[PDB]
Every structure is written in structure tokens, then in C-alpha cells.
Amino acid sequence: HSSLITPLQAVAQRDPIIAKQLFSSLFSGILKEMDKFKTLSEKNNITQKLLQDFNRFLNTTFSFFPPFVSCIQDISCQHAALLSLDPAAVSAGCLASLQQPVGIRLLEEALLRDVLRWVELAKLYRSIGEYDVLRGIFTSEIGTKQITQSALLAEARSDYSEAAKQYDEALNKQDWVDGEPTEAEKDFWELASLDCYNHLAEWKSLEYCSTASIDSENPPDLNKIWSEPFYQETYLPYMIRSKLKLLLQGEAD
Numbered sequence: 001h002s003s004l005i006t007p008l009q010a011v012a013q014r015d016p017i018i019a020k021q022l023f024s025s026l027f028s029g030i031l032k033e034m035d036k037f038k039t040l041s042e043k044n045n046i047t048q049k050l051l052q053d054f055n056r057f058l059n060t061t062f063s064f065f066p067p068f069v070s071c072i073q074d075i076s077c078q079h080a081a082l083l084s085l086d087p088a089a090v091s092a093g094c095l096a097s098l099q100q101p102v103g104i105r106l107l108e109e110a111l112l113r114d115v116l117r118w119v120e121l122a123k124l125y126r127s128i129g130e131y132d133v134l135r136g137i138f139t140s141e142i143g144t145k146q147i148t149q150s151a152l153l154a155e156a157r158s159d160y161s162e163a164a165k166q167y168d169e170a171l172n173k174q175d176w177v178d179g180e181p182t183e184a185e186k187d188f189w190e191l192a193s194l195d196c197y198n199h200l201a202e203w204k205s206l207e208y209c210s211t212a213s214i215d216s217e218n219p220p221d222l223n224k225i226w227s228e229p230f231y232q233e234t235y236l237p238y239m240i241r242s243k244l245k246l247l248l249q250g251e252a253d
Contacts, residue, residue, distance in 0.1 A: 008022065017067060028079075047079075050081075054082065054086075091103065091123055119187075121137065122137055144179075144181070151170075160196045164202075167196070198242075204246060206238065207239060210242065
């Protein structure tokens with residue numbers, strides 16, 4: 001009546017998956033067991049300390065380990081407290097640890113019952129293909145500007161000339177007095193401009209439009225691409241790719 005509990009821990013340290021699923025069951029079991037006594041003014045602060053530790057884990061980890069990442073993101077999505085865990089670090093964790101489709105489900109359960117979650121969900125679904133939910137979220141919650149649908153229709157069918165030539169018009173809207181958008185599509189217009197620049201053989205405007213929006217009239221391209229960690233993710237690879245394809249024709253430059 002005890003000779004099963006000890007081989008559980010004996011097989012635990014052998015391979016990580018069984019122990020990961022064991023811990024993810026056991027913590028949820030004890031956390032369900034604390035619901036009986038320990039009344040309402042305890043669970044709130046206990047869960048706040050818990051999510052503080054989970055945010056601490058996901059921020060401070062440096063050696064990317066996929067079963068550990070999936071373990072913490074699995075035990076997050078199973079109670080009524082940990083849903084608003086971290087709409088920022090979860091995407092970096094699942095992208096650098098190649099474990100997208102558990103953090104994706106955590107973000108969807110977060111969006112059940114709130115803009116940057118959609119933004120980093122777009123950066124999530126950009127990793128695994130899935131372009132027909134990528135377009136599907138850039139018309140629902142990021143929008144209310146009537147250039148978005150007009151460029152997305154010329155982008156849904158591959159016609160990436162008009163899909164570029166109604167974005168540089170949209171970027172420099174001077175007054176446009178009907179209300180002004182948030183930054184959540186100010187970046188999206190530039191990013192989709194980069195993408196439709198890249199889908200055609202057009203890098204000369206692409207490098208100038210990428211490297212223009214970070215610095216002054218002449219590029220240092222020296223530390224600001226390395227500082228401000230948005231710039232290592234978004235502006236970096238299209239810039240280096242465009243410079244590469246532009247040099248590979250044959251120049252000196």
C-alpha cells in the first residue's frame with residue numbers, strides 16, 4: 001500500500017517528461033486541496049506571491065528548457081487566478097523555447113472574459129505559419145481605420161504593389177480628424193509595410209524604411225539595433241536580409 005509511491009519518485013529523475021507531468025498534476029492537486037479551509041483573504045495574496053514567482057521564473061531564466069517552460073505554462077492555465085500572468089514575457093519564452101502551442105492556449109484563455117495580448121499573439125502565430133488567423137486578427141481588434149481592409153484585400157490575393165502603395169500613404173496621415181489610432185497599429189502599418197516590401201524583390205526601399213525609423217538622417221547602425229530589445233527582434237532580420245540581398249548583386253558599398 002506504499003510500494004507504488006516510492007517507484008514514482010524513483011522513475012521521476014530518469015527522463016523529464018513523466019516528472020514534469022507528475023509535478024503539473026501534483027501542484028494542481030494540492031492547490032485544489034487548499035480551497036476547503038484558508039478562506040478568501042488568503043488565496044488572493046498566496047496566488048499573488050505565486051504569480052510573482054512565476055513572472056520571476058519566466059523573466060530570470062536564461063538557459064532555455066522546453067519541458068520546464070511547458071510545465072510552468074501548463075500549471076498557469078488551470079486555475080482562476082494565474083490567467084493574467086504576463087502578456088509580455090510569455091511570447092519571448094515560447095518563441096525562444098520553441099513551445100508555442102501551450103502559451104497560445106494560455107493567451108486565448110486570457111482573452112476569454114487587452115491589446116498587447118493581441119499584438120504578441122500576432123507575433124506568436126507568425127512563427128508557425130497560420131497566416132489566415134494573422135490576417136484574421138488584424139481586422140478585428142487592431143483597426144477601425146479604413147485603409148486596413150483596403151490593403152488587406154490587395155494583400156490576401158498576392159498583389160503586393162498596391163499593398164505597399166497604400167501604406168506609405170497611411171503612415172504620414174497628417175491630421176485625419178476622425179480620431180487617432182493607438183501605437184498598436186502604428187507599428188503594425190510599418191511591419192506589414194516591411195513584409196509586403198519583402199514579398200516582392202524590393203529591398204532598396206526596404207532597408208531605408210527599416211533603418212530610417214530607428215535613428216537620424218544618417219545611420220550609425222552601431223548600438224541602437226543592439227540596445228532596446230524590440231530592435232533585435234523586429235527591425236533586425238529584415239534589415240540584415242535586405243542588406244545581404246542588395247550586396248549579393250555585386251557592388252562595393
